[PDB]
Amino acid sequence: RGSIEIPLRDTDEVIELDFDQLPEGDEVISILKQEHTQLHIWIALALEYYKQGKTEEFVKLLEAARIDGNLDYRDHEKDQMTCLDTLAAYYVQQARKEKNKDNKKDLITQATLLYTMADKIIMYDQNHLLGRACFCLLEGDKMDQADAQFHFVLNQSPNNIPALLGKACISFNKKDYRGALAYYKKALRTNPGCPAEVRLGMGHCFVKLNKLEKARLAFSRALELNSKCVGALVGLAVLELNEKQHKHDLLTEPDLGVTIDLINPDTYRIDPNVLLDPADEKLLE
C-alpha cells in the first residue's frame, strides 16, 4: 500500500512507517516532534490517515504540525498553506454535518481563523482561494465573492476541477442552467474519474433544463458509482411525480449535493489511463 521515510535527526538513517501499519496517532506525533521532522512529512502522514478513514489522527497530526512541524527548508510557506487550508477545509466539512448549533459555530470560527492567518502567508495561493471561495458559498450572500475567486482560478488554471464545480454551482443558483451544465460537463470530460456526485449536479441541471430523460440517467450513474449517493435517490424518486419546477427547488440542497473536496489531493488527480466510460459519454452528448 505504501510507506513514508522519516529522517532521523543528526543521522544518515531513516525510519519507515508502513501505511498498513500506521501507529497510534499520538506516537507518530512524538516521533516527528523528536526528530524535528519537516512540515511536508507531517502533512503526508496526515493525509494518509485521512485516506485510511483515520480522521482524528489526521486532525491531530496537522494541528500538532502547526507547532512542531520544522520549517527549515525552501518552500516551507507552501506547506504552511496546505496545512492551514486543509485544516480549515476539514472543519468546514464537519460544520456542514454537525447538528449542535453551538458546536457548528465553533467549527466555523476555527475555519475562519485558519483562513485569515493563511491569508498572511501566501495571499493568492490557488488552493487557498479555492478554500475561501467554497467558504463564501458555505453561507452568505458572498456568492459574488465566491464567483470572483473561482473565476480568477480558471483565469490561471482553466481545467481546475474544484473551480469548475464551484462555477457550476453558482451558475445554477443564478439559474443559468445551460452554463451550470456546461461547467459540470467540462469537469467530467476533463477528469473522467471524478466523484459520483458530479453527475448528481448534472442531474439537477438536466431537470431544470427540461431534459427529464438524461436527468434520470445522470442520477442513475451516480448511484452506480456510489450506491450511498442520496440526493440522487431523492432525484430519481421525484421523477415519479410530473409551476412544476418548484417541487424540484426544495429537494435540491444549495451545493446541489456536490461537495467540492479540498482535503484529499487525489479526488481529482487525472490518471491519463482512465477513459470516459460509456454511461458518462451518453450524458455528455
Author numbering: 3 to 244, 1067 to 1109
Quoted from the paper:
The highly conserved eukaryotic multifunctional polymerase-associated factor 1 (Paf1) complex (Paf1C) was originally identified in budding yeast over 2 decades ago1, and robust data suggested that it plays a vital role in transcriptional elongation and chromatin modifications.
The crystal structure of CTR9(1–249)–PAF1(57–116) was determined at a resolution of 2.53 Å and with one molecule per asymmetric unit. In the final model, all residues were clearly visible, except residues 1–2 and 246–249 of CTR9(1–249) and residues 57–66 and 110–116 of PAF1(57–116), presumably owing to conformation flexibility. The helices α1A to α5B contained five sequential helix-turn-helix repeats that exhibited structural similarity to TPR. Region I was mainly maintained through four conserved hydrophobic amino acids (L80, V82, I84, and L86) in PAF1 and corresponding amino acids in CTR9 by hydrophobic interaction. Region II was mainly mediated by two types of interactions between amino acid pairs from PAF1 and CTR9, respectively: hydrogen bond in D90/K53 pair and hydrophobic interactions (such as P89, T91, T92, I94, and V98 in PAF1 and corresponding amino acids in CTR9). More, in the co-IP assays, it was clear that the I87M and E109K mutations of PAF1 and the P164S, R201C, and A220T mutations of CTR9 totally abolished the interaction between CTR9(1–249) and PAF1(57–116).
